[PDB]
Specification:
This is part of a larger assembly, with two copies of chain A (116 residues), one copy of chain B (73 residues), one copy of chain C (63 residues) and two copies of chain D (339 residues).
Chain A lengths: L1 H10 L3 H17 L8 E7 L1 H9 L5 E8 L14 E7 L14 H11 L1
Antiparallel strand pairs in A: 1-3, 2-3
Helix pairs in contact in A: 1-2
Chain B lengths: L6 H16 L8 H13 L3 H26 L1
Helix pairs in contact in B: 1-2, 1-3
Chain C lengths: L7 H16 L6 H14 L20
Classes of the chains: A alpha+beta (116), B mainly alpha (73), C mainly alpha (63), D mainly beta (339).
PDB class: ligase
Keywords: proteasome-mediated ubiquitin-dependent protein catabolic process, ubiquitin-dependent protein catabolic process
Entry title: KCTD5/Cullin3/Gbeta1gamma2 Complex: State C From Composite RELION Multi-body Refinement Map
């Protein structure tokens, strides 16, 4: 367990060693994002013409997970702007807490502004 | 890039390690550490400082180790 | 230095060569080739499916 | 020094070849003679529309079994169409995107392709496991593969990027005979029906016709000043049409070693992006950076007709290996077959 | 200790900047001459509607070629639109939501992202595969990115939180020019067409026009009572329009070292959330936290007209670099092309 | 472990050695595409009758991921010239070195030309 190595680093409280084992645990969590740790998700919106393009030009690391059609008021199907949602994912590293996910005041101000 | 706040400590440690190697000591020195030290101290365009320190330290090794043993026997 | 110049003398040498055997290539008169192509085109002027359309029950592209 | 003397020798040889061409020059009989009669205006129809593409068709390529045509899509998919039934006999997901070169074997035993990945893909079509498994990934090409052509089922000519055209052995994965004569990026290619003489068009605007087994050029037809988009041999291999990106196609004869007549028009100004002959070769098929393409009488350089109905440039053309129909593989993401 | 004498020095220095400014302060001939180039009430059509996003358009940036445009949605996605044809040239997922700034490179081959990740994301648009993959992850900002601009394809200015607007080397990922002059959160940014001066707006309401060549605050234009939302240089690059969270815009001139004139109505109380200035340098385009936006005849100091049709607050503006049309990326997940 | 081999390579100097060992690690991690996480995706437009064909005659080295129908206006919404998108994928390195960017300017010209 890299967690055990991190605990041993804590016992000798070597900060560089702490950082290194936490980097190892982050690499683990990115590689083990399906073990419940950080895992990022998004949805793109495209129609078929751009759909092929950005499926083909999908980023290295982001994995396609699902496509879906959305009801098209034009004709019955294709060639409507609302054509396909594209839910994609990426196995993202989980950073051990105490060093990450630390908010800021103006960031929260803007978050409240954009929430509505 | 260019900033002198950290270069002094790593520089003196690196030159001390170079001398230790000159003083026939690698049983306590890791080549990876000294190699990384030289690399980070180079790529920040401090290579003139290494060229100077290298020149002076090889001259110092010649005087302090080579010349003494040449003359003493 | 233009006696080696990163072996640009070599590419100049090959250029000289290619021009030499291009000059060595026997020219065949323009009207001669024109008559030859006239003969070939006319000999194949009524067997070209593109010069006389194939009915779309006679072509493999409408079967 | 040596460079200056060699350059002067080259210049005087150029002058000598120019003089030899001028002596070889004659009044072109085809254009002068109206007894052969203009081909007229042919009302030409699409028999098949290979809809099912939705990426741009970069460069199509008719099959050499004369029924199954490979099309290369911009997104990195290879569609072996059955032209006769509008049925895709195969779709290959290509590990490379931005692919232009699709090459069909004389048998369909293998298919080859190349894009900007700099690796020549050779897929064994008829694997007896009933799938399309990659056979050989040829590595060692300098730049992007510009245009491939199957001449052997163990060797293939691969006009590569950045002034390279090396023929490649499939089984070793090694090149067979490098071709280093071009100064511009070797980005067009055409094989004679003789299948021994390939004329490659590059960005140097000079169509270099090489023999396959010489491993060293034989002719350099320079009648164009713009990069040579496409080259199509005459159905006899005694001449070829070459389309460069100004407005102009040119007919170069191998016996005269010079351009015969020119295909430059003021009714259309776009650079001729693709060229092809008829079965007889009397009809010149000029694919344009214009959304449409045209057909001219190659003997008279007058317009036989206009092939339109697209919305984007005809980015490749193909005629049947024996010849009964012409497929326009355009960037509008489908192919229009005209017969 | 000694901070008192420096504080008094700066205090009387500010006194005499104010004195020099007001001595330089004359009545604008622009407001006096209202009959010169009047636009009346100008109304323009939304003729293209880039509706592809699904979240709030946080802040869009035009392309340097003035055909493409990067639009960052509130959810953490980029839509590199082709404005001329309404096709999403790319759609890119972002590993951090709440991304507010997307930046488009001079080359058009890189894109920059700034959200709350405290990392500048540089995605190469064109790679050897043709896909859009991350090129660089500029990490090391103490605060969070709020705006960015591509100084070049290897140097980028990142107006980030925690009093930083540091230049970053793209290739080495190393911070280049540290700025520590701000006291508020550096959250607005604007790059001159001269490209030699970047004016950063922050929560300290101080438009710090920094010199990009030496990284020292060339001027600190002040006069706004709120954090500076957006800044947009004059087309000559000799001045910049500034819109803070107050209900007024201002025009700060470097030659006069003072604000030439303000742009405020009692008709609006909303903070000026985006400023963008016409190609001729006449019309100032003010985005508002109200449902609409406005065009001011800034050389007449009055409202040229109101552009309405977005049902939510238009949270970003961008004029075409040919100066004939504008994109209004609102928070209604709809981007409209007003022309 | 990647860290052990990386440090043991750095102990043997040369920057070319460092780059080659990094490329070897990226090869052994990117052929399965874990940490480099390199995956290729394609959209095959196939209509109904053709379907079982390329599903059965898929290219080896690939894996099917999703199939989605298309709204159609001919033949009761079934059997259109575009009737299904078969989104297929495969996990492997595009290059085991993780290389990008080409020096050929003509390739760039063509990429921009085909982009619009």
């Amino acid at each position: 367990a890299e967690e055990g190595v991190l605990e041993e680093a804590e016992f000798y409280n070597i900060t560089s060693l702490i950082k290194l084992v936490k980097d190892k645990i982050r690499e683990r969590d990115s590689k083990t994002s399906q073990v419940p740790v950080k895992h990022v998700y998004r949805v793109l919106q495209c129609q078929e013409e751009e759909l092929t393009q950005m499926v083909s030009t999908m980023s290295d690391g982001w994995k396609f997970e699902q496509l879906v059609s959305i009801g098209s008021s034009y004709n019955y199907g294709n060639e409507d702007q609302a054509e396909f949602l594209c839910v994609v994912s990426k196995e993202l590293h989980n950073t051990p807490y105490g060093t990450a996910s630390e908010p800021s005041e103006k960031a929260k101000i803007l978050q409240e502004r954009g929430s509505r | 890039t260019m900033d002198e706040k950290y270069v002094n400590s790593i520089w003196d440690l690196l030159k001390n390690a170079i001398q230790e190697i000159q003083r026939k000591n690698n049983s306590g020195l890791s080549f990876e550490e000294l190699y990384r030290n030289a690399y980070t101290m180079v790529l920040h365009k401090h290579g003139e400082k290494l060229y100077t320190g290298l020149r002076e330290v090889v001259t110092e090794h010649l005087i302090n180790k080579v010349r003494e043993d040449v003359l003493n026997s | 230095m233009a006696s080696n110049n990163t072996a640009s003398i070599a590419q100049a040498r090959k250029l000289v060569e290619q021009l030499k055997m291009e000059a060595n290539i026997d020219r065949i008169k323009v009207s001669k080739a024109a008559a030859d192509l006239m003969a070939y085109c006319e000999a194949h002027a009524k067997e070209d499916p593109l010069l006389t359309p194939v009915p779309a029950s006679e072509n493999p592209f409408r079967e | 020094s040596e460079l200056d003397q060699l350059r002067q020798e080259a210049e005087q040889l150029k002058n000598q070849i120019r003089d030899a061409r001028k002596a070889c020059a004659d009044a072109t009989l085809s254009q002068i003679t109206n007894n052969i009669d203009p081909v007229g205006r042919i009302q030409m129809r699409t028999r098949r529309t290979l809809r099912g593409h939705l990426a741009k068709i970069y460069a199509m390529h008719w099959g050499t079994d004369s029924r199954l045509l490979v099309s290369a899509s911009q997104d990195g998919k290879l569609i072996i169409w059955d032209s006769y039934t509008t049925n895709k006999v195969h779709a290959i997901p290509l590990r490379s995107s931005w692919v232009m070169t699709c090459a069909y074997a004389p048998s369909g035993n293998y298919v080859a392709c190349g894009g900007l990945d700099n690796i020549c893909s050779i897929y064994n079509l008829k694997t007896r496991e009933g799938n399309v498994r990659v056979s050989r990934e040829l590595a060692g090409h300098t730049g992007y593969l510009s245009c491939c052509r199957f001449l052997d089922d163990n060797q293939i000519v691969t006009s590569s990027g950045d002034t390279t055209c090396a023929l490649w052995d499939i089984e070793t994965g090694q090149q067979t005979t490098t071709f280093t004569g071009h100064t511009g990026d070797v980005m067009s290619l055409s094989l004679a029906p003789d299948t021994r003489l390939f004329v490659s068009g590059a960005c140097d605007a000079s169509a270099k016709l090489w023999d396959v087994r010489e491993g060293m050029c034989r002719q350099t037809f320079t009648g164009h000043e713009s990069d040579i988009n496409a080259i199509c041999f005459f159905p006899n291999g005694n001449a070829f049409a070459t389309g460069s990106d100004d407005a102009t196609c040119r007919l170069f004869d191998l016996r005269a070693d010079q351009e015969l007549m020119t295909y430059s028009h003021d009714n259309i100004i776009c650079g001729i992006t693709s060229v092809s002959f008829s079965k007889s070769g009397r009809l010149l098929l000029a694919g344009y950076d214009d959304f449409n393409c045209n057909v001219w009488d190659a003997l008279k350089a007058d317009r036989a007709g206009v092939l339109a109905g697209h919305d984007n440039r005809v980015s490749c053309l193909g005629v049947t290996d024996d010849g009964m129909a012409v497929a326009t593989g355009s960037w509008d993401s489908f192919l229009k077959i005209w017969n």
